[PDB]
Amino acid sequence: VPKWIQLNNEIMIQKDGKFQFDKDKEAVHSYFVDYINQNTVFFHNLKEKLDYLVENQYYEEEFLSLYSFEDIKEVFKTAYAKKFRFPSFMSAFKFYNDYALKTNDKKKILERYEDRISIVALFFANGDTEKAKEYVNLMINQEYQPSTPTFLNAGRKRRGELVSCFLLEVNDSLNDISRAIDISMQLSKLGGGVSLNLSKLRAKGEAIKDVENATKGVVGVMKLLDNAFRYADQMGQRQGSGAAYLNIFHRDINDFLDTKKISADEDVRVKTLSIGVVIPDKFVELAREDKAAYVFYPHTIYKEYGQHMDEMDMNEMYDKFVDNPRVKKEKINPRKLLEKLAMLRSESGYPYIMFQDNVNKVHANNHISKVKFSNLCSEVLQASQVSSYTDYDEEDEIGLDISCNLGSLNILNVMEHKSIEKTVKLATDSLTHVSETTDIRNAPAVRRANKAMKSIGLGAMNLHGYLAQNGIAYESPEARDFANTFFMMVNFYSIQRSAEIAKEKGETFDQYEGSTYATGEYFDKYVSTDFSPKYEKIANLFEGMHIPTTEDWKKLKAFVAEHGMYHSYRLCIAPTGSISYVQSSTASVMPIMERIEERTYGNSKTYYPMPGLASNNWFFYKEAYDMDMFKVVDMIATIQQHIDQGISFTLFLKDTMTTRDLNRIDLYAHHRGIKTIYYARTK
Amino acid sequence: VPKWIQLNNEIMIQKDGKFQFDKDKEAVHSYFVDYINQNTVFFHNLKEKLDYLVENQYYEEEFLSLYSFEDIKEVFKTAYAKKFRFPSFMSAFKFYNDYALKTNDKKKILERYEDRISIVALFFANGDTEKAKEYVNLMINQEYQPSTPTFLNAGRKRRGELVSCFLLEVNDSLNDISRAIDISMQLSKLGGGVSLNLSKLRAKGEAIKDVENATKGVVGVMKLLDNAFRYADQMGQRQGSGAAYLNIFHRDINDFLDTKKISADEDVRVKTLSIGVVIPDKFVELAREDKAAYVFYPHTIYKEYGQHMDEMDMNEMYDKFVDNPRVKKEKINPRKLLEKLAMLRSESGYPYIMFQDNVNKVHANNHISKVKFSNLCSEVLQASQVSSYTDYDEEDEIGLDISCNLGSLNILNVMEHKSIEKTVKLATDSLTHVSETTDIRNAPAVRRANKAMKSIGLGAMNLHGYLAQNGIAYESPEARDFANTFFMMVNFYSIQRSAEIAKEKGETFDQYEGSTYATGEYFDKYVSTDFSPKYEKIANLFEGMHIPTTEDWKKLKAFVAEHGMYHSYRLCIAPTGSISYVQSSTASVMPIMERIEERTYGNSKTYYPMPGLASNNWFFYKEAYDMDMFKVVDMIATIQQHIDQGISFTLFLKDTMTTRDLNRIDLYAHHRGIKTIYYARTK
Amino acid sequence: DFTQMFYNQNVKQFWLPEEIALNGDLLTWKYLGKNEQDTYMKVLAGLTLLDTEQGNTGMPIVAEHVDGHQRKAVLNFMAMMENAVHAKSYSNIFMTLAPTETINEVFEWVKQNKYLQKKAQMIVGLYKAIQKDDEISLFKAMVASVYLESFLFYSGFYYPLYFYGQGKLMQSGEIINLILRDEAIHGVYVGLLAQEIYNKQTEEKKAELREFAIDLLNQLYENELEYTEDLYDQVGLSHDVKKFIRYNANKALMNLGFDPYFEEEDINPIVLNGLKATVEPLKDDDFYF
Amino acid sequence: DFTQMFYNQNVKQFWLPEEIALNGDLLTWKYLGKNEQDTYMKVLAGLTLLDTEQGNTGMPIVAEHVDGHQRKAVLNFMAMMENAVHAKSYSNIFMTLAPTETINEVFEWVKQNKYLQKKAQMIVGLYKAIQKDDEISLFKAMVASVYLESFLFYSGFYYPLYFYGQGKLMQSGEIINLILRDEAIHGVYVGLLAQEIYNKQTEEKKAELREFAIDLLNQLYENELEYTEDLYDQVGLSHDVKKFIRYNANKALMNLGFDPYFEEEDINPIVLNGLKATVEPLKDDDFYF
Numbered sequence A, B: 001v002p003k004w005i006q007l008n009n010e011i012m013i014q015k016d017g018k019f020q021f022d023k024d025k026e027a028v029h030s031y032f033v034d035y036i037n038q039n040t041v042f043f044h045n046l047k048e049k050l051d052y053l054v055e056n057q058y059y060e061e062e063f064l065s066l067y068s069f070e071d072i073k074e075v076f077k078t079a080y081a082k083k084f085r086f087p088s089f090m091s092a093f094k095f096y097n098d099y100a101l102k103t104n105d106k107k108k109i110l111e112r113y114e115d116r117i118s119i120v121a122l123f124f125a126n127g128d129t130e131k132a133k134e135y136v137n138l139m140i141n142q143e144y145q146p147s148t149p150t151f152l153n154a155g156r157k158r159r160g161e162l163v164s165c166f167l168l169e170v171n172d173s174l175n176d177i178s179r180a181i182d183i184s185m186q187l188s189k190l191g192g193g194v195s196l197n198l199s200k201l202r203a204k205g206e207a208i209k210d211v212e213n214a215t216k217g218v219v220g221v222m223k224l225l226d227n228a229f230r231y232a233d234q235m236g237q238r239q240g241s242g243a244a245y246l247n248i249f250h251r252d253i254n255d256f257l258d259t260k261k262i263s264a265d266e267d268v269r270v271k272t273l274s275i276g277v278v279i280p281d282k283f284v285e286l287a288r289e290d291k292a293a294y295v296f297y298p299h300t301i302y303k304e305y306g307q308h309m310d311e312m313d314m315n316e317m318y319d320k321f322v323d324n325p326r327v328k329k330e331k332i333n334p335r336k337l338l339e340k341l342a343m344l345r346s347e348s349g350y351p352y353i354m355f356q357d358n359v360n361k362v363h364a365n366n367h368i369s370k371v372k373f374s375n376l377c378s379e380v381l382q383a384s385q386v387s388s389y390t391d392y393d394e395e396d397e398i399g400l401d402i403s404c405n406l407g408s409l410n411i412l413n414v415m416e417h418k419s420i421e422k423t424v425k426l427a428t429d430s431l432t433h434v435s436e437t438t439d440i441r442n443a444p445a446v447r448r449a450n451k452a453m454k455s456i457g458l459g460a461m462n463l464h465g466y467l468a469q470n471g472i473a474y475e476s477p478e479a480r481d482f483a484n485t486f487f488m489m490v491n492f493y494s495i496q497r498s499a500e501i502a503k504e505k506g507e508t509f510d511q512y513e514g515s516t517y518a519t520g521e522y523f524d525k526y527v528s529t530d531f532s533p534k535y536e537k538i539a540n541l542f543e544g545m546h547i548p549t550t551e552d553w554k555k556l557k558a559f560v561a562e563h564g565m566y567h568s569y570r571l572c573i574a575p576t577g578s579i580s581y582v583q584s585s586t587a588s589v590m591p592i593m594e595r596i597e598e599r600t601y602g603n604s605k606t607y608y609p610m611p612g613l614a615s616n617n618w619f620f621y622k623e624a625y626d627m628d629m630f631k632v633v634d635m636i637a638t639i640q641q642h643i644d645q646g647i648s649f650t651l652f653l654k655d656t657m658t659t660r661d662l663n664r665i666d667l668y669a670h671h672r673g674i675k676t677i678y679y680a681r682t683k
Numbered sequence C, D: 001d002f003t004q005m006f007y008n009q010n011v012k013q014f015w016l017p018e019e020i021a022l023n024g025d026l027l028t029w030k031y032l033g034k035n036e037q038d039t040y041m042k043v044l045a046g047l048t049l050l051d052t053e054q055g056n057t058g059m060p061i062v063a064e065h066v067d068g069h070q071r072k073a074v075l076n077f078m079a080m081m082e083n084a085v086h087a088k089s090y091s092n093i094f095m096t097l098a099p100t101e102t103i104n105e106v107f108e109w110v111k112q113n114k115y116l117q118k119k120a121q122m123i124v125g126l127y128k129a130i131q132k133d134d135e136i137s138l139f140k141a142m143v144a145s146v147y148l149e150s151f152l153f154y155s156g157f158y159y160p161l162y163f164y165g166q167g168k169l170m171q172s173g174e175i176i177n178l179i180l181r182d183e184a185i186h187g188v189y190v191g192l193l194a195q196e197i198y199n200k201q202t203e204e205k206k207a208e209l210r211e212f213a214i215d216l217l218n219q220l221y222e223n224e225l226e227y228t229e230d231l232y233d234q235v236g237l238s239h240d241v242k243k244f245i246r247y248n249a250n251k252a253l254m255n256l257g258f259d260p261y262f263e264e265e266d267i268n269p270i271v272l273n274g275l276k277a278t279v280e281p282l283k284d285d286d287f288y289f
Ligand SMILES: Nc1ncnc2c1ncn2[C@@H]1O[C@H](COP(=O)(O)OP(=O)(O)OP(=O)(O)O)[C@@H](O)[C@H]1O
Pocket: A028, A029, A032, A033, A037, A084, A085, A086, A087, A092
């Protein structure tokens, strides 16, 4: 057992009835005195290091060639002047095991934290030394964290794509299904998580070229996609991850759900394909009134109306579908379906729940399309247009496939530096740069939507960490007040930066003129409701920072009207799995699952306390499972009212609560305006 | 139970110790006087029938519009003038259950045998009334039988494709793999059996752009193809059938074979994809000498030499592969691999065995490409060039994917009518028409190969029926002499018709100038060796027909040199599974499995005696399992010497014999020049 | 050829009633109508009563007359599952859903019920008729046992599976599914032991044993139809239950190496949702001809 | 007052030999003398025979005659343990340590060994003499069963325990300790059932039953002495084992409610060292907040 691992395991050993949290710090020192410095490759000067990394195909020549060597050296010096120290052993371990650049033999460390941050900053700035230094100060203060793809791969020649969330629309044809399989394989090859909408696909027992009972339904397509994702597994590094979304009014919805049951046969169950269910308000109304619902055959609806079932508003179309004899449908019990969803989420955490009307009643780009499905993490909610992939030697009709750009603000570090505006604007600029530098040659609709929509996702993390280190309970009304104010400022500065980029470049996102930004509707609740903190403690937390008022929001609305907005979507709160360790932050805006988490690496045990955990804030670091899920829903809705896309919202349940409690949480989330529900993790 | 069912079951009820074969005839009468005539749909005249079939989307109106109604009436009258009668109940039952056109609800019979034959003939003639009458006389005499796709689907609006088998070359890339999956689904949707050569795909543990041990090998692609064929299953009517072919020198050859082991795990086992193994002469030489062999990693060979492992001759490059340190290889025991092949064929009948050198030592189009794999029935052996399917928005390099049209001569009916020449020429014309009117819009390499190669497959059926009905034992040297003479005549007249078509159209198949037809090498054994019958009985059997001599072959060689050949490939002997029932013929050139076969249909059981089975020829209808497989190999080699493509050669084994006997049969087949071995069916 | 394989599958399927918490079924149970609750109770009591006969007599009597140490061990294991696991599981389900007085009354009713008694006594009669060293009487009892394990239970299993497939009474439905999975393997195993006896017989004796099996199946089937209408007409399910009985009758016949008796039918989708040649080395000179 | 707690104890003690990996004993086995290996194989073979008959015959027959579904469930479970778990575990040990020929030879040796045949004849004879509704014949068989559980196994158990206590053959020894833990509770349980029957008798009848029990014990004891000498003389341990079997004879008598018969002696201290989620329906009030 290594010395740092012993020093880390000494945390659980209680002295005077208290955990030895400070010992973790010592572990970090050991982890750097015994391992990191010994296995870190050192060079006589930075010029030699850069030459070795470029020549050995570690870095890219293009992004480094935009700067003189003096500017690169100045950026590296700015990164190293902070003298950044990892506060916990797990932060440094996760960085140097997951993100630090290693030799081809994987035994030496080529990149420190400062080196990786400097390289990512130089990639972000695209030739501006001052902008690169600003990015270096942003990331070394740990105010902003690029996502795992961006942070890991920026500036590296041997790399995947910087985007890892991809949403694909699948049209109801064999050509479109095969193209979807191909694109899923190509994007998993790039290292991205792929979500596919299967609602347009006709159900099982439908007609193919006017022969009856011929379609295999969406379950056969799910089997094909599951095989494709198993095959494309990042060159045998990570398990291929894919998601499939189906509307709850699709007839296959039960069989869809049956793919996640343990009792399902081998020809029914898909193991590497996550599933999500899109639930329109009509289904919730039918379940609430206990009226029996109807699941429709999509192809009959398409033949009758010329549009797909998921392309029209089910609230106004459901009665017409039911009363139409030419539309084929099957009787179901919506309450039984809700109970089945709750039971499946209890067993396996699936499916993801998308409340379609909750997403689309605040969607700014409904003119382009309504949000029909979400991503693999159930937080990307954007307009998508299906593509018509025709036969060979025939021109395809390329639509819009969602691929947003991830990046997370560290709420604790951002707010302690009183730099919400600067961090949000710099993160928006970096996300815009990464979106502009993304070029996928095997996903035509993804590339077209990236060029047109210019959608980015700016998330936040360390919400619970910040609240606990400031003596605020996550379920307290003060925490929701802080979340409201902080995320309203984040939205304000994100919109301001998007409008500034649109003014500078002279271009907005495609079909912006039809958006609620152009019409000013988006700013309605912002020009009438003041989002300043209602509690003195939160106001003192925001001291030293200008909180945008209704007049500021009116000025921003006028600015957007005059200049437009560059990004169709700006904010989405991703789970932030492993980057939260490196940043010493709690994951996403979720409450912490455990105060101290026990992990097993190799044959060794390691202990990670939550950041800033001590005896004084032990009570404020309440575990997520012990919390009331209604108050967690309230906080997530408070944040969601300022996020244009969704939030990865995992439910944290105890083994005691039943499926009725899960359904109640889901229905309260639907009532409170929650757009997506990610997971049902049972303790 | 139906009356005809009782009459057919009365065959096995012996009277005076003999089977009541004549009862079978009675059954057909019943089957027509109680079911077919009552279930048939009669019109006032042919005009109303044709109009009803045209407007109700049963028939394509284009092929019928090329004839005036008087000509169509004359063709139908020619078909009905023969007064064709089905001699066995099973012939009529199979036609009216599998090939006769029925209504949309399948409650009535719209097409008689004469109606189907007339429609197929009118489609074949393409506006020529005299040619349509010739086709009608050829098919109503049952001298020639179009394949099941062509016979069933010719002239139908709801038809599929007329091509039975498709062969795809899969290049070593994710884009090519995805395109192969798409094309396999498209062609299975069209109803054709798809064969894919996986020998170019790099083995398991190869590098995908400098990251090693990343590839899943051919087994992952096999699983993808298996799921694709499961999904595309002819709209749920016929199970999707696919074939995978791998060279025996591929490193994955064991894992390949492990896909068919009955103890294979679900993550490896493949159940809807047939497997074939391509064995060069080098492997047989290594096994014979008991020298340990080496299987190779295709990607290392491609990197070192710039060509795929199966793209070059292993007999001359195996030592270079072994001595090359930059080529990666694994040690295997070739005798152990042969024993594994024999055990697998005993257990499940797989893999198909393709003796590559036996195919390519007489292959006429080696300049275009060597034959690297076979079809799903292991009888199509043609040159194929792999396609380079590139990224989206990039032009693809379209290669040649094999596809040929099947058609079988009924040997008994052809020789009874003394019309080898006329039947062969008319069948060649019909297959040329089927190739010309075939246009597949989702398989580009298949379309290009169909347009360029113009390859057709003219098979033969009722070899054993003709031999047994003429008092010739199938294993006798007289039977092999008859096969030699008959198939030399078939080859002569097929080459003559191909050259005549090339002369009349002024065009040959692509790259004909480099073929052995153009250089005259193909005719060598035909201009030096006489293939006239060596037995007086066979010569009497061939009386009334001009058997080509060496002078006729020299004249044909000069004619080909002057005019060329329209078809790259002309003769391939398919299994002819279910259409042999309608023709009252034994399946293909294979010996009969059983004298009387008991088949269960619905809740009833039926007995089909072999065509012409009686007391005097009971022992001439020797069952295949009771026959010496070495003499069957001799027969198949004798036929194969006159067939440019392969023959679907099924091995018929007894349970008592061991895997050593199967290996001996395989090695004798390789020694005798057998190109492919189809199945190892054990009694 | 098969006993060690079945030993493995049996012991790896071992489970205990305590593993499934039953109390959460009360949430769904309270929402069923009187007819649904009545049918469920009656079906449950039917299964309980039949399974007790199998534990006290059926499995132990077969274990007694079968020769072979390994077969006796597998049969003992199966008898244990009936008495120690299944019987306690049925009792647990009852005690959770009904008060003591209601349980006693349902068992009084089902104990007097004509259709339940007819089948219970027919099966028990064949077990009581086994004679020492007479393999014909043993075979007849094995046929009866397979019919119970693979056929007679299924008119009963239908209802818990029907609820289980709808998201109702999930805890007791999970228990029933585990029980059913045990009875399936019991039926297959006893079926193989019966085929062993059958295959030792002459052709005339075989034809006679086939007639016995089909005649017995017919008697039981006609009573099952009456049993089914008696229980399921009040909840409108009898048509679909009848399809499920025939489908399981065919499985029971296949377990005994016999052909299916009934035409293939599709089953209710809710219930569905609930549910070597001798290797001889090449000796060389086999490559030369 | 006791069956439920025995039921719970028996089912919580459930185990399979495959849970214990045996390849760790390979070296300490290899290192034993030929005499030691011979005695060890034969000892376990004698145990295998006893468990074979206890599982096939003894426990099932007692289960048949004892009234009450819970008592029958305990006895059925114990029967399963005998032949499906205990008897089989010995084959796991044999298959690990010994080549097939040595295994074949030791099973041939049990068939021809006169002491092992005599003890089987005596015990199984009493099992097969049980008459329905005759409590005295049942008592006699239960005494025989207690003597098998708590006395007869111990001439065999001595040797694995003797090695375990020296840190030798510890994986095999772990299996044996699990078997011994089971037999101890089996002997107590059957002892309590025997006492029930004994306590129903007149004083005169009781006096005869004590005579039966003591005469049977002495007869079995005298045979076990000869068996012990036959096995252990070649390893020098016969006198030590004899002390152990007398110790356990007293425990068997005590399980039957009788006073100890042999005087206390010091036992080898080595041998002493050898010792789904719950589902509720959705109410209309759960849709409003
Ligand atoms: N907690 C930590 N986080 C990150 N790096 C660390 C940490 N502890 C030590 N290191 C690394 O080890 C070096 C030694 O640091 P130490 O605590 O011994 O003193 P120092 O004054 O920071 O040293 P130096 O002269 O290297 O700057 C640091 O410069 C840094 O590179």
